[PDB]
């Protein structure tokens, strides 16, 4: 039914969905999941599909691997995940390259690996 409910989107939710489809690979997507809010009216013949908009913050994480801070856009729950499994270094090492659906996470991942390898 989901392929139907995407086609039943109100124009603000549809424009927000197009922007989500454009700028997904620009921000960190650790455990982030987009969601539709379809509300069910009991006096029937009305199913209004919308979007549950994610919340975004520009947190400045300190990398304990290489001596700098990086700024990068995240959600609350992926910040929970990163700061509750060990930090940016442990996340960028132990989450390999495909659960990262993100470009700056991949770039800082390569910089952590290269700087750490030259640090050996």
């Amino acid at each position: 039914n989901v392929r139907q409910l995407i086609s039943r989107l109100i124009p603000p939710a549809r424009k927000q969905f197009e922007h989500l489809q454009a700028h997904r690979r620009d921000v960190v997507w650790g455990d982030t999941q987009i969601t539709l809010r379809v509300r069910q009216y009991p006096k029937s013949k009305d199913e209004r599909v919308s979007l549950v908009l994610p919340n975004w913050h520009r947190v400045r994480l300190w990398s304990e691997a290489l001596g700098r801070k990086v700024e990068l856009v995240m959600t609350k729950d992926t910040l929970r995940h990163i700061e509750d499994m060990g930090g940016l270094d442990a996340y960028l090492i132990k989450t390999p390259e495909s659960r990262l659906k993100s470009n700056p996470a991949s770039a800082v991942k390569w910089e952590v690996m290269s700087a750490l390898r030259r640090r050996e």
Partner: peptide, 25 residues
Amino acid sequence: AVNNKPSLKYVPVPESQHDDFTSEP
């Protein structure tokens, strides 16, 4: 007059699991 307050439901929009790599490197 009648009451028509809706019941909310959240559908997880399946989100293909592991990855693909057809995008920009």
